[PDB]
């Protein structure tokens, strides 16, 4: 019964902090924002980094990533955003990586745990991912010691 | 002596004394009381619950 068309190991998604998205023919994997936090909100003007991996499903042609827009600020793409035929396009350097990067200039406060919409277009698609804020291998921030009460 | 009133208001609350079954640890004792979602550190004493 559990080995039928509806399985519990085939429908299982990725156990990470990213979002799986399909931009027509390019698959977006582990889409997350890296943003160290100190206060409840990340104030506007703070520079954060958007990290994801673009996979080209088609193995015949190539694709190039342009015009990443979101309602959190301005997103700047630096480097060769062209994905090969049957290769990957890794943008940013996540923790545990021993050069294309996405730079975001905030205009409104953001915080961990919420979802913020992002638009990804390469040549034949306009899809929304709702990118969250994910913390990598950073250690737990210290908590002030409470008093006697 | 064994009989006790289940609904006797004995628990302080922001809107007067209430019964035990209607309240819990998350019930505010006054308006605007801050209750933190503290985690159990697993050690006895020395801040067993932290922010």
């Amino acid at each position: 019964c559990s080995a039928g068309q509806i399985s519990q190991t085939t429908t299982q998604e990725p156990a990470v902090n990213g979002v799986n998205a399909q931009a027509g023919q390019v698959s977006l994997r582990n889409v997350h924002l890296r943003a160290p936090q100190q206060t409840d909100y990340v104030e506007p003007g703070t520079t954060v980094e958007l990290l994801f991996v673009a996979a080209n499903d088609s193995t015949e042609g190539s694709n190039k990533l342009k015009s990443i827009t979101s309602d959190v600020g301005e997103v700047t793409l630096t480097g060769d955003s062209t994905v090969p035929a049957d290769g990957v396009l890794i943008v940013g350097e996540p923790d545990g990586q021993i050069a294309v990067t996405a730079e975001v200039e905030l205009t409104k406060p953001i915080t961990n745990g919420l979802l913020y919409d992002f638009t990804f277009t390469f040549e034949d698609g306009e899809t929304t991912v709702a990118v969250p804020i994910s913390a990598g291998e950073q250690p737990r921030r210290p908590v002030p010691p409470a008093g006697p009460g | 002596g064994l009989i006790k009133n289940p609904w006797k208001p004995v628990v302080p609350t922001a809107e007067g004394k209430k019964a035990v079954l209607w309240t819990s640890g998350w019930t505010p004792r006054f308006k605007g009381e801050t209750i933190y979602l503290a985690r159990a550190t697993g050690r006895p004493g020395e801040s067993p619950f932290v922010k």
Binding site: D40, L114 | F30, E33, T34
Partner: peptide, 25 residues
């Protein structure tokens, strides 16, 4: 016998506001 007080809704909802914390405990 479905519980009357347990009905699903399609309302989207709003993001909760920042907690302030009243003084004088």
């Amino acid at each position: 016998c479905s519980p009357p007080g347990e009905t699903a809704s399609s309302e989207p909802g709003t993001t909760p506001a920042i907690w302030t914390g009243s003084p004088s405990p």
